[PDB]
């Protein structure tokens, strides 16, 4: 957990944050793509059913 991840992934583990959360305040970006972040911010997680990609054409006659 203390090794490389998102900086929010290290926030909910090792409640230490003025050691750790203010350290990566200096020159640090944070993209995405954990499992603990997208649940924390409101996005679908990548594992499970958020991995499939759909596509569908559209004449769609009922018959």
């Amino acid at each position: 957990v203390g090794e490389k991840a998102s900086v929010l992934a290290r926030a909910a583990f090792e409640i230490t944050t003025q050691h750790l959360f203010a350290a990566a305040e200096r020159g640090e970006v944070d993209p995405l793509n954990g499992v603990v972040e997208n649940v924390l911010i409101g996005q679908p997680v990548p594992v499970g059913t958020g991995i499939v990609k759909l596509a569908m054409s559209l004449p769609l006659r009922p018959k």
Binding site: E25, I41, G42, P44, V45, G48, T49
Partner: protein, 96 residues
């Protein structure tokens, strides 16, 4: 008159299945949802102003480039507790 609370055990027993649609709908849709206006090039929140319409981010004063972002209310308060302390949380948002 309050319900149950779903700890960190109960969040992880749904990720083990593979349910990602249920995990959104349970934790945020049946909870607090707030709609927030956010600037684009500063990253900070905008400020609405009734009686005079027009919304504008103070920091660098823009006019039209501004949108709406859909996020929980407890995450929006996490922005302010990092804002009272001198940390600045710049948001750099993305199209769908």
């Amino acid at each position: 008159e309050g319900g149950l609370r779903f700890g960190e055990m109960e969040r992880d027993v749904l990720i083990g299945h593979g349910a990602a649609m249920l995990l959104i709908e349970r934790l945020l849709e049946e909870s607090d949802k707030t709609e927030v206006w956010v600037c684009e090039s500063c990253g900070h929140l905008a400020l609405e102003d009734k009686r005079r319409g027009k919304v504008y981010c103070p920091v660098c004063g823009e006019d039209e480039r501004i949108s709406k972002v859909e996020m929980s209310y407890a995450f929006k308060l996490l922005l302010d507790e990092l804002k009272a302390m001198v940390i600045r949380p710049s948001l750099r948002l993305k199209d769908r």
